[PDB]
Design a protein around this ligand. Sequence first.
Ligand SMILES: O=C(O)[C@@](O)(COP(=O)(O)O)[C@H](O)[C@H](O)COP(=O)(O)O
Ligand SMILES: O=C(O)[C@@](O)(COP(=O)(O)O)[C@H](O)[C@H](O)COP(=O)(O)O
Ligand SMILES: [Mg+2]
Lengths: 83, 447, 90
Amino acid sequence: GIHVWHVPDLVSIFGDDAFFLFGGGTHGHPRGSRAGATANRVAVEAVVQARNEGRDILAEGREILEEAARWCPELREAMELWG
Amino acid sequence: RAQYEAGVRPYRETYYDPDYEPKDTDLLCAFRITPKPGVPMEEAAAAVAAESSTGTWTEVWSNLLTDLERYKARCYRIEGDVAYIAYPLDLFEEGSIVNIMSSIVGNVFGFKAVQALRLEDMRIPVAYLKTFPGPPTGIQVERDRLNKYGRPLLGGTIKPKLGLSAKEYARVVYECLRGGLDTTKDDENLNSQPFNRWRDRFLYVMEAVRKAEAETGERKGHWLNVTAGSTEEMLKRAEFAAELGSRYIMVDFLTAGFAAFASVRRRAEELGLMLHCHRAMHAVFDRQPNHGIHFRVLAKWLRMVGGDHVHTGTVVGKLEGDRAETLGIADLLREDYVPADPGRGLFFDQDWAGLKPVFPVASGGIHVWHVPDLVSIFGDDAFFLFGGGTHGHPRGSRAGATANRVAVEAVVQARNEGRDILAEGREILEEAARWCPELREAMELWG
Amino acid sequence: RAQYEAGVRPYRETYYDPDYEPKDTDLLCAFRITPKPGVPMEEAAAAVAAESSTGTWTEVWSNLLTDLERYKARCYRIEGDVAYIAYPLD
Ligand SMILES: O=C(O)[C@@](O)(COP(=O)(O)O)[C@H](O)[C@H](O)COP(=O)(O)O
Ligand SMILES: O=C(O)[C@@](O)(COP(=O)(O)O)[C@H](O)[C@H](O)COP(=O)(O)O
Ligand SMILES: [Mg+2]
C-alpha cells in the first residue's frame, strides 16, 4: 500500500537494487495513471538524487518531497491526496 | 479528462452487501477473521473480500472502465467471528486449482488489518466443478483392480525413513507384503538419495512386489515415490514406474505444488497408474485453529484436480486431529452429496456432480490397539497404514504384518456380526489373540 | 526548477528610490501625475517609471536572467504633484 509519501522510507531500506511497485498508488492519482506514474517517478528520483548529496533521507524526506512538488504538479497532487 | 472521486475509501461501503443472496454459481468462502483492535468485523470482512477480488487500497480511475458489480466479491453474511464471502463464477479460470489458491488465499492473509485469518470451508459450484477431471480411478475401479472387497485395505511405510540401501529396502518390502499387508509405500522424504537412488529402488521393489505377489496368491502393490525437483523429472519417474508393471505412484501433492501435481495426474492416467497423494507439509497450513487453510479445503482441492488417496489422519495416532472434523473430511471425499453439518466443521452443502470418490488414508503412529477406533471412524473404504507398527513387532515385519491383518479381520468380522466395536474392541482383540500368536506379542508390547 | 516569488507586487517596492543620485548620462523626465483616488502619489510615480522600463504588472521569472538594477528606471524625487524619473542611458 505504498505511495509517494513512503518513498523516503523505502529508499532508506533497499537502496538502489530494488523494485518499487505502485499499483493503487499510480491509478489512485486523482487525475489518471499517466499523471500518477509521473508522480511516483519524480518522487523516487528526487529522493535518490538527494541521497547522493548526503541529505539524511529519514529526516528530510518531507522537505525533499515538498521541494520536488514545488515544481512538479503531479507529485504535488499525489501528496495532497494521501497522508 | 473525465473526473472521478479519488481518495482512500473504506472497504465496507462497496464490498459489504448484507442483503446479498448468492446464486448457485458462486464460490462461497467462510473465513475466520481476527481483526486489529478498533477495526470492526464488518470492515475487516470487506478487506478480505476486496483484496481477493477486484479491490485495492484506493479508488482507481479504471474502476469506471468496467462494470465492477459484475466481478466484485462481497461479504454477504457475518456470524460474529466467521465472514461469508461470495465470489462470482467469472473470477476464476476453468480447470485450475492454482487460480483459486492464488486468489482466495493469496495476499489477503498478510494484511496489517487482520491479525489472523483461517479459511474454514468453501462451496465449489457445479458450474465451476464440472471443468475438473476428478480422480482417475476412484474407489470402485480400484477395488476391482486389486480384487479386494469388504474390508479396509492395509498398508505400511518402510522404516527407517532413510538410510536403507536399495537391496535392503526391497527385503523389508517383501516381508511386509508376504506377511499380509495389501500394499507398502515409500516415505515422503525418500526420492533419489545417494544411499538409495530411484532407478535402483524402483527395480528392486517391483522385484519384491512381484515375488511376494506370486507366493501369497493375491494382488500387491507399492506406492513408489515419483516426486522430484521438477515436473519433467517427476513425469520421467512416473513412466519408469509404469513400464515396470507397477499399479501405484505416490506424489507429495503439497510440497511439489498443485501445477506439477495436475501435470503428473494427467500423465499418470494415460499410463494406467493409480496415484496416491501424500499431504506432506499440510500442518504448516492447518495446525493452529486461528490461521491457515483447514484441511477440508485442501481435501476439496485434491478431489477436484484428481487423486486416488489422501491422508485424512488418524485421530488416535501421533498426529493431531479432531474426530468430528475427520469424519466430515472422510465423508467429503467419499460421498456424492455432503449436506452441511455445523457440528462437524462443515459450512456449505457440497454437491460433487459425478466426480468419483477417494480413499481416505489413515496413517500415523497406529498399532494394533487402535484398530477398533479406526474401523468405526472410516469403515471399509479406507487404508490403514501401519508404518512403524509393522516393523516394530518383536519378531520382525512379517510377524507384524500378520498381526495387523488379523486385527483388522477380527474387528471387521465382529462388526458384521453386530457387536459394538467401541465397547468390545479389547474383548475382540483378545479373542483374536487367543489363536493368533503374532497378534498377542504385538497387542501386549504396545498396550 | 528555479523558485521565484510570483504574484503581483507593488510598483513602489522595486521602482521607487528616494536615495538615488542621478548620473550625468541618465535621462530625467519630470512627469506631472494625477492618480486615481485611492492610489498613493509615491505609488503611481513608481508605476510610470516601471512601465516605461523593464517592469510590468507581475513578477516574471525572466527578471532573474538580467541584472535588472542596471537597466530599470526609478523615481528619485517627488514634489507632491511632479515626479522625477531617471532612465539609464543603456
Ligand atoms: O496484489 C496486490 O495487492 C499488489 O499488486 C498490490 O497492489 P497495490 O500496490 O495497488 O496495493 C501486490 O502484489 C501485493 O502487495 C503483494 O503483496 P506482497 O508483494 O507483499 O506479497
Ligand atoms: O512418518 C511418516 O511420515 C509416516 O510414514 C508415518 O510413519 P509411522 O506409520 O511409523 O508413524 C506417514 O507419512 C505419516 O502418518 C504422515 O502423517 P499424515 O498421515 O498426517 O500425512
Ligand atoms: Mg511418511
